[PDB]
Design a protein around this motif. Structure first.
Motif, PDB file in Angstrom:
ATOM      1  N   UNK A 165       0.804  -1.207   0.000  1.00  0.00           N
ATOM      2  CA  UNK A 165       0.000   0.000   0.000  1.00  0.00           C
ATOM      3  C   UNK A 165       0.849   1.276   0.000  1.00  0.00           C
ATOM      4  N   UNK A 166       1.961   1.226   0.723  1.00  0.00           N
ATOM      5  CA  UNK A 166       2.913   2.305   0.950  1.00  0.00           C
ATOM      6  C   UNK A 166       4.138   2.330   0.065  1.00  0.00           C
ATOM      7  N   UNK A 167       4.627   1.174  -0.358  1.00  0.00           N
ATOM      8  CA  UNK A 167       5.770   1.204  -1.236  1.00  0.00           C
ATOM      9  C   UNK A 167       5.616   0.177  -2.346  1.00  0.00           C
ATOM     10  N   UNK A 168       6.098   0.417  -3.563  1.00  0.00           N
ATOM     11  CA  UNK A 168       6.797   1.631  -3.998  1.00  0.00           C
ATOM     12  C   UNK A 168       5.835   2.773  -4.356  1.00  0.00           C
ATOM     13  N   UNK A 169       6.358   4.020  -4.485  1.00  0.00           N
ATOM     14  CA  UNK A 169       5.518   5.152  -4.828  1.00  0.00           C
ATOM     15  C   UNK A 169       4.799   4.952  -6.169  1.00  0.00           C
ATOM     16  N   UNK A 170       5.352   4.193  -7.115  1.00  0.00           N
ATOM     17  CA  UNK A 170       4.690   3.996  -8.400  1.00  0.00           C
ATOM     18  C   UNK A 170       3.830   2.729  -8.450  1.00  0.00           C
ATOM     19  N   UNK A 171       3.600   2.103  -7.293  1.00  0.00           N
ATOM     20  CA  UNK A 171       2.808   0.883  -7.162  1.00  0.00           C
ATOM     21  C   UNK A 171       1.381   1.267  -6.771  1.00  0.00           C
ATOM     22  N   UNK A 172       0.885   0.696  -5.670  1.00  0.00           N
ATOM     23  CA  UNK A 172      -0.459   1.009  -5.219  1.00  0.00           C
ATOM     24  C   UNK A 172      -0.699   2.504  -5.020  1.00  0.00           C
ATOM     25  N   UNK A 173       0.324   3.217  -4.537  1.00  0.00           N
ATOM     26  CA  UNK A 173       0.199   4.639  -4.331  1.00  0.00           C
ATOM     27  C   UNK A 173      -0.226   5.368  -5.583  1.00  0.00           C
ATOM     28  N   UNK A 174       0.394   5.019  -6.704  1.00  0.00           N
ATOM     29  CA  UNK A 174       0.105   5.621  -8.007  1.00  0.00           C
ATOM     30  C   UNK A 174      -1.287   5.183  -8.474  1.00  0.00           C
ATOM     31  N   UNK A 175      -1.514   3.885  -8.291  1.00  0.00           N
ATOM     32  CA  UNK A 175      -2.799   3.282  -8.672  1.00  0.00           C
ATOM     33  C   UNK A 175      -3.982   4.018  -8.054  1.00  0.00           C
ATOM     34  N   UNK A 176      -3.939   4.115  -6.736  1.00  0.00           N
ATOM     35  CA  UNK A 176      -4.981   4.799  -6.015  1.00  0.00           C
ATOM     36  C   UNK A 176      -5.092   6.264  -6.424  1.00  0.00           C
ATOM     37  N   UNK A 177      -3.951   6.961  -6.543  1.00  0.00           N
ATOM     38  CA  UNK A 177      -3.985   8.361  -6.934  1.00  0.00           C
ATOM     39  C   UNK A 177      -4.748   8.546  -8.248  1.00  0.00           C
ATOM     40  N   UNK A 178      -4.449   7.708  -9.255  1.00  0.00           N
ATOM     41  CA  UNK A 178      -5.055   7.713 -10.594  1.00  0.00           C
ATOM     42  C   UNK A 178      -6.564   7.508 -10.561  1.00  0.00           C
ATOM     43  N   UNK A 179      -7.023   6.701  -9.613  1.00  0.00           N
ATOM     44  CA  UNK A 179      -8.441   6.385  -9.493  1.00  0.00           C
ATOM     45  C   UNK A 179      -9.330   7.295  -8.645  1.00  0.00           C
ATOM     46  N   UNK A 180      -8.847   7.713  -7.476  1.00  0.00           N
ATOM     47  CA  UNK A 180      -9.643   8.512  -6.560  1.00  0.00           C
ATOM     48  C   UNK A 180      -9.534  10.015  -6.674  1.00  0.00           C
ATOM     49  N   UNK A 181      -8.473  10.469  -7.314  1.00  0.00           N
ATOM     50  CA  UNK A 181      -8.307  11.895  -7.403  1.00  0.00           C
ATOM     51  C   UNK A 181      -8.929  12.623  -8.583  1.00  0.00           C
ATOM     52  N   UNK A 182      -8.766  12.110  -9.798  1.00  0.00           N
ATOM     53  CA  UNK A 182      -9.304  12.817 -10.940  1.00  0.00           C
ATOM     54  C   UNK A 182     -10.767  13.181 -10.863  1.00  0.00           C
TER      55      UNK A 182
END
Length: 310
Positions: A165-182
């Motif tokens: 969930x926390x590492x790496x920054x381009x893993x789940x972190x990126x995934x979630x950012x792409x989905x919940x933020x836009x």
């Protein structure tokens, strides 16, 4: 009673490689007035049933390359769309989607259709949910096909199921950012990024269910539930670990998408040890998170492995 919306049928007119007729159920106990879509392919009177569960932010379209392989083998294949995805109805409030809401839908479906001799096929959310089903009625489950998935347990019991969930920054972190933020989430663009070999037509099939953000509440909640696990989720997932380790006696086939930054080998090897009798995994070097996109191979190998014991 659950305020929901339905995707207009015209949005699916032009799908690529999706010649499967729709089946719908709207009389499910606990889901009043909600229509769920599912594919029911192959011989309806088959002894073997492949129950194919999708993840975030996909739908049964994800199993399109695997369906035909399993059906031709003589089995019946059931591939439902969760509420909030594919052709199923979509609750408009994120608060309506919970682990139990999706889990209970599955148990209802299974009872409603009276499925037995099930070969569970899971990946991502399809596995977070599907892996907790057998303990509820073990007699109906006989085999398992597991692709990049794990159990939503607490960090202490299984750190491997939380570290991503926390590492790496381009893993789940990126995934979630792409989905919940836009605020204008384009799923075709997201799929192309996360499943780089998709053609444009395929990518568009992933955006088909959602005409606008109002149809995307389920889409937005899934990643949040990976990050914030409720107690019921934790307790249920923890009890499932024990099932797999000590109770399960069925046949298992494991396939790993090696390029997945989320649920790759550091999550899969740990899962492999928890499943009693799981054999050596089939590593697919060029596959990412959406293992199903290279599904024909997975379907063929699993069938080969299972025959070789039946």
């Amino acid at each position: 009673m659950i305020n929901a919306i339905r995707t207009p049928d015209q949005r699916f007119s032009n799908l690529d490689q999706y010649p499967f007729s729709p089946n719908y159920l709207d009389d499910l106990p606990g889901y009043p007035g909600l229509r769920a879509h599912y594919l029911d392919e192959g011989n309806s009177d088959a002894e073997d049933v492949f129950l194919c569960l999708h993840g975030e932010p996909t739908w049964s379209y994800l199993y399109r390359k695997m369906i035909p392989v399993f059906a031709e083998s003589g089995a019946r294949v059931i591939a439902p769309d969760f509420f909030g995805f594919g052709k199923s109805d979509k609750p408009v409030d994120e608060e309506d989607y919970t682990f139990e809401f999706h889990r209970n839908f599955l148990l209802a479906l299974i009872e409603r259709l009276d499925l037995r001799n099930i070969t569970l096929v899971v990946q991502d959310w399809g596995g977070f949910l599907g892996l907790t089903l057998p303990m509820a009625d073990p007699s109906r489950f006989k085999r398992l096909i597991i692709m990049n998935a794990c159990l939503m347990t607490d960090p202490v019991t299984q750190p491997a199921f939380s570290a991503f969930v926390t590492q790496p920054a381009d893993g789940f972190t990126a995934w979630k950012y792409d989905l919940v933020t836009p605020s204008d989430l384009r799923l075709d663009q997201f799929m192309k990024r996360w499943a780089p070999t998709l053609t444009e037509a395929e990518a568009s099939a992933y955006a088909a269910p959602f005409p606008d953000t109002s149809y995307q509440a389920g889409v937005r909640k899934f990643p949040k539930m990976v990050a914030q696990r409720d107690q019921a989720c934790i307790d249920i997932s923890t009890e499932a670990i024990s099932f797999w380790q000590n109770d399960w006696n069925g046949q298992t086939f494991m396939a790993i998408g090696m390029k997945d930054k989320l649920l790759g080998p550091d999550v899969m090897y740990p899962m492999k040890a928890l499943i009693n009798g799981c054999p050596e995994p089939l590593e697919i070097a060029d596959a990412g998170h959406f293992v199903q996109e290279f599904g024909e191979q997975v379907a063929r190998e699993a069938l080969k492995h299972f025959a070789e014991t039946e």
